Write a protein that binds this ligand. Structure first.
Ligand SMILES: *[C@@H]1O[C@H](C)[C@@H](NC(C)=O)[C@H](O[C@H]2O[C@H](CO)[C@H](O[C@H]3O[C@H](CO)[C@H](O[C@H]4O[C@H](CO)[C@H](O[C@H]5O[C@H](CO)[C@H](O[C@H]6O[C@H](CO)[C@H](O)[C@H](O)[C@H]6NC(C)=O)[C@H](O)[C@H]5NC(C)=O)[C@H](O[C@@H]5O[C@H](CO)[C@@H](O)[C@H](O)[C@H]5O)[C@H]4NC(C)=O)[C@H](O)[C@H]3NC(C)=O)[C@H](O)[C@H]2NC(C)=O)[C@H]1NC(C)=O
Length: 116
């Protein structure tokens, strides 16, 4: 009784899942690219340990258009795909795929919390 939803709004990049297969708590299934990979989540392709990329005038293409992998909420069963790759999608509202079986598990800690 749960539906797989992303964390942002952008465009599908890929799908590492199957129709009628099982899922895992934190298992990648979908992917969406957006102009916002959080300020404390994405680790970016690489870093600047030193003068290896010359950030002084390095390229910007290597630091943008990040991607957000959509991992299942909890192990169980996954249905089919509603949309396809290369198709723009909205925030969590996008119910491309849904998960069935198992109980509704939840235990994250990224951001957007009002429990203090
Ligand atoms: C997603 O993909 C992208 C493609 C990728 N980007 C690119 C371009 O490819 C993204 O990576 C980028 O973004 C991430 C995070 O979003 C990473 O950047 C973070 O980490 C960096 C270090 O590696 C930087 O942080 C450093 O600089 C800041 C200031 O801007 C902080 O330092 C300040 O504060 C300190 C403590 O308060 C010091 O100040 C104290 O000492 C002085 C000395 O006199 C004074 O007395 C002060 O008054 C003191 N403080 C107090 C309170 O009294 C420090 O000197 C000061 N700097 C300045 C200039 O003033 C930071 O340290 C943290 O600071 C906070 C509060 O400031 C403190 O609470 C923490 O304890 C402390 O850790 C510095 N850290 C280091 C290790 O040097 C970035 O600014 C930081 N981001 C943010 C939002 O803060 C990544 O490296 C980025 N890459 C590039 C190329 O830019 C990628 N990921 C994400 C998440 O987007």
């Amino acid at each position: 009784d749960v539906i797989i939803k992303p964390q942002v709004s952008g465009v599908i990049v890929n799908k590492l899942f199957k129709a009628g297969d099982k899922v895992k708590k934190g298992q990648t299934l979908f992917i969406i690219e957006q102009d916002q990979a959080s300020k404390d989540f994405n680790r970016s392709k690489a870093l600047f340990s030193q003068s290896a990329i010359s950030q002084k005038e390095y390229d910007s293409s290597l630091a943008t258009l990040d991607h957000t992998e959509i991992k299942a909420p909890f192990d169980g069963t996954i249905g089919d795909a509603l949309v396809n790759i290369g198709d723009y999608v909205s925030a969590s509202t996008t119910e491309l795929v849904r998960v069935t079986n198992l109980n509704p598990i939840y235990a994250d800690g990224s951001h957007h919390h009002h429990h203090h």
